[PDB]
């Protein structure tokens, strides 16, 4: 439901079915044989 996140917190709720509608969440090496 409601997401409480530290910034003293803030609340985010997604109102849309599609995730795209969501707001942006800011959270020796010289010698070798092959």
């Amino acid at each position: 439901g409601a997401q409480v996140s530290s910034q003293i917190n803030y609340t985010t709720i997604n109102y849309y079915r599609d995730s795209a509608s969501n707001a942006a969440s800011k959270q020796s090496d010289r010698v070798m044989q092959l």
Binding site: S28, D29, V31, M32, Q33, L34
Partner: protein, 278 residues
């Protein structure tokens, strides 16, 4: 005669280990297997080296001498009623080369004598079956001077009497060397010349140890002569047995010239081949 290691599956490699690179300056041979440089599958190896053991390599009778004798009237000075062959493997080449792959060897020896005979003319009657005496004369024993002198009593020498038409005669001897092994090569002399000795003293052949190291075989036809001359050849076949060998050497590349390592002819064995020609 041991079996051979299986080939193990080997996949891609990307690492600092470089088996391909080496340094032959050290004198060692890089012991690489195919899996060291290419991708390989698993192969259960079934081949073995049973036929390249030294025993298997020498387990063959090789002809080392053809001793010709006659059965003829002793008044015929052209005929040779007995023959003395000094024992050696250096009268032929094949067995010599095989032996000289190595510097030292110990082996018992099997001698097999194949005797053939024939008439020389057709106007002097026929002959009854001949018997041949093959007497070993160890060094120091008296050498026969005539086909019927006392030495043929062979009271102490071993002798083989072979009846013509019988299967080739055969005897065996153990390792009889006075050293702990036979020396195929001897880098030395029998004598060391000493300062002040005349030029005719202290001189010996290079590489010879004994003037008579293994003695001789004296061969005669025991029968008294028929009215017609008969000629016979005794072919001697040597087979080393229970062979041990030390210090391998590069094999003879140019024709043998005498019992030493000397060479005179055929000094161009390699043929011509382009550098970039397959």
């Amino acid at each position: 005669a041991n079996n051979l290691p299986d080939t193990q599956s080997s996949g891609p490699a990307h690492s600092k280990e470089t088996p391909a690179l080496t340094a032959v300056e050290t004198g060692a041979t890089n012991p690489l297997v195919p899996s060291d440089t290419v991708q390989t599958r698993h192969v259960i190896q079934k081949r073995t080296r049973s036929e390249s053991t030294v025993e298997s390599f020498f387990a063959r009778g090789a002809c080392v001498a053809i001793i010709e004798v006659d059965n003829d009237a002793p008044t015929k000075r052209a005929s040779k009623l007995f023959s003395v062959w000094k024992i050696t493997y250096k009268d032929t080449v094949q067995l010599r080369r095989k032996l000289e792959f190595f510097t030292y060897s110990r082996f018992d020896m099997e001698f097999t004598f194949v005797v053939t005979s024939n008439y020389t003319d057709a106007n002097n009657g026929h002959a009854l079956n001949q018997v041949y005496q093959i007497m070993y004369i160890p060094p120091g024993a008296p050498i026969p001077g005539k086909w019927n002198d006392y030495t043929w009593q062979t009271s102490s020498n071993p002798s083989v009497f072979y009846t013509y038409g019988a299967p080739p005669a055969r005897i065996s001897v153990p390792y009889v060397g006075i050293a702990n092994a036979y020396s195929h090569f001897y880098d030395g002399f029998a004598k060391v010349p000493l300062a002040g000795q005349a030029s005719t003293e202290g001189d010996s052949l290079y590489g010879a140890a004994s003037l008579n190291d293994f003695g001789s075989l004296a061969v005669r036809v025991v029968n008294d002569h028929n009215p017609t001359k008969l000629t016979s050849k005794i072919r001697v076949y040597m087979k080393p047995k229970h062979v041990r060998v030390w210090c391998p050497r590069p094999p003879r590349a140019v024709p043998y010239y005498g019992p030493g390592v000397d060479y005179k002819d055929g000094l161009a064995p390699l043929p011509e081949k382009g550098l970039t020609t397959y």
